[PDB]
């Protein structure tokens, strides 16, 4: 599995079967972009995970 | 002063005479972007601040 | 003004008349803590700012 | 596997064989605490991962 990771395509570790994309906004000026290989999403996070190469945006 | 703040334009409080845009990566899969109104940046990152409306593109 | 900034005490720039301590959790496994000198907080989070040395414990 | 997750002990998903602890400091006022279940650490992150219940701090 290969996933996008902030301008790089990285190869996932054998135990990372998913690519992931999510964003966070904890403070008015602060945005977080979580992008990369990952393990399984939460139930709440169901669509933040994808299983195909380079699928994470 | 007005500044960009993650897709919107916000009006700054009186004591905030700067627009800021700083981009970090504290972990490989996590990017952080500070964008909004601000007080003065430090000298080391002096250019991270600008002082005109919508300057922090 | 002096404020706590993640285990240290820093002197604030002239235009920063507040100490701030805000704690967020944009993802379940990720906590974010803002602690340092600051300009004025918003009304909605008015109490997140204080105005005396080392007030932002 | 059970790991600490910001004041909670959570049960890891079958594909999360590790607990994880790390911190990030991308900006002078900003500290990040990454704590929870995880998949395998990077090579650079070798000691941020642990394999026993509640081992992540």
């Amino acid at each position: 599995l290969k996933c996008y990771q902030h301008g790089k395509v990285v190869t996932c570790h054998r135990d990372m079967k998913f690519c992931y994309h999510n964003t966070g906004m904890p403070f008015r000026n602060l945005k977080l972009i979580l992008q990369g290989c990952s393990s399984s999403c939460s139930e709440t996070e169901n669509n933040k995970c994808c299983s195909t190469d380079r699928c994470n945006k």
Side-chain angles (χ1 to χ4, degrees), chain A:
Chain A
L1 193 63
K2 300 200 157 39
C3 300
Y4 291 116
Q5 195 195 78
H6 299 303
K8 293 172 196 135
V9 169
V10 299
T11 308
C12 303
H13 293 352
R14 175 137 279 161
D15 61 333
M16 296 196 303
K17 302 313 202 185
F18 312 89
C19 304
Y20 184 84
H21 190 282
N22 201 5
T23 62
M25 198 89 76
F27 312 114
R28 294 249 296 150
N29 294 357
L30 184 56
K31 176 171 185 192
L32 283 76
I33 307 173
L34 244 194
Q35 197 192 28
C37 292
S38 151
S39 46
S40 53
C41 275
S42 311
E43 73 280 347
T44 90
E45 281 188 316
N46 255 21
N47 259 14
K48 309 298 175 186
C49 288
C50 59
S51 305
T52 74
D53 297 319
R54 300 194 273 99
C55 59
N56 64 332
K57 168 199 83 181

